[PDB]
Amino acid sequence: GLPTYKLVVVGDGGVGKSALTIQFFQKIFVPIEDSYLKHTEIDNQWAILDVLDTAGQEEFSAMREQYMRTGDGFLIVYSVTDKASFEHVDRFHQLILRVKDRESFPMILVANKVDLMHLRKITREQGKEMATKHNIPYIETSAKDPPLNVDKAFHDLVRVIRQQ
Numbered sequence: 001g002l003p004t005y006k007l008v009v010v011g012d013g014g015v016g017k018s019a020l021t022i023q024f025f026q027k028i029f030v031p032i033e034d035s036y037l038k039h040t041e042i043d044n045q046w047a048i049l050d051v052l053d054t055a056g057q058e059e060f061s062a063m064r065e066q067y068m069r070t071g072d073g074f075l076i077v078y079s080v081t082d083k084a085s086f087e088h089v090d091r092f093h094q095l096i097l098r099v100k101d102r103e104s105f106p107m108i109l110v111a112n113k114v115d116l117m118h119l120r121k122i123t124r125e126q127g128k129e130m131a132t133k134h135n136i137p138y139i140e141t142s143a144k145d146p147p148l149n150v151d152k153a154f155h156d157l158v159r160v161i162r163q164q
């Protein structure tokens, strides 16, 4: 069948992992334990996306490493209003690279909640520096209607996987 990409959304609790996933699959924002399946055409090439919306809790090491092993690409999401979620980007990138036993792997740093500009604590420049440090692309998103770069984040991840 069509090429299948297993995309895994990781990040601290409350950063907007589910809101981004639901916006991407249902085009809704309302403030399902299975991974989500859809067809999508990216750069005139149809594909099947299999998207796992992870839980921001500590979870279990066995369950966590398992879905990291099966992922073809990862979105590392933080909230621009949450400093701790931004600092934990280093932990998510290192942990996924450790599981993969790789120096690099298709991932994109996602700075979510950029609509909350008066609560924003992580600047765009801080976000780009973080992405540059980890050698991954940077994109700013908002899952609140009207959504910002939600489709682009997932599609660009597939593009990275394709150009890997």
Ligand SMILES: Nc1nc2c(ncn2[C@@H]2O[C@H](COP(=O)(O)OP(=O)(O)NP(=O)(O)O)[C@@H](O)[C@H]2O)c(=O)[nH]1
Residues within 6 Å of the ligand: 011, 012, 013, 014, 015, 016, 017, 018, 019, 020, 030, 031, 054, 055, 056, 057, 112, 113, 114, 115, 116, 141, 142, 143, 144
């Ligand atoms: N203003 C705004 N609120 C957002 C955005 N994304 C998520 N939220 C809000 O922030 C809260 C947490 O979002 P949620 O999607 O549950 O985050 P999560 O990363 O899945 N949390 P968990 O790890 O506990 O599953 C919700 O109230 C949601 O509506 C965004 O881009 N903008």
Ligand SMILES: [Mg+2]
Residues within 6 Å of the ligand: 017, 018, 019, 053, 054, 055, 056
């Ligand atoms: Mg969630």
Ligand SMILES: [Zn+2]
Residues within 6 Å of the ligand: 118
């Ligand atoms: Zn203002």
Ligand SMILES: [Zn+2]
Residues within 6 Å of the ligand: 090, 093, 094, 133, 134
């Ligand atoms: Zn890193």
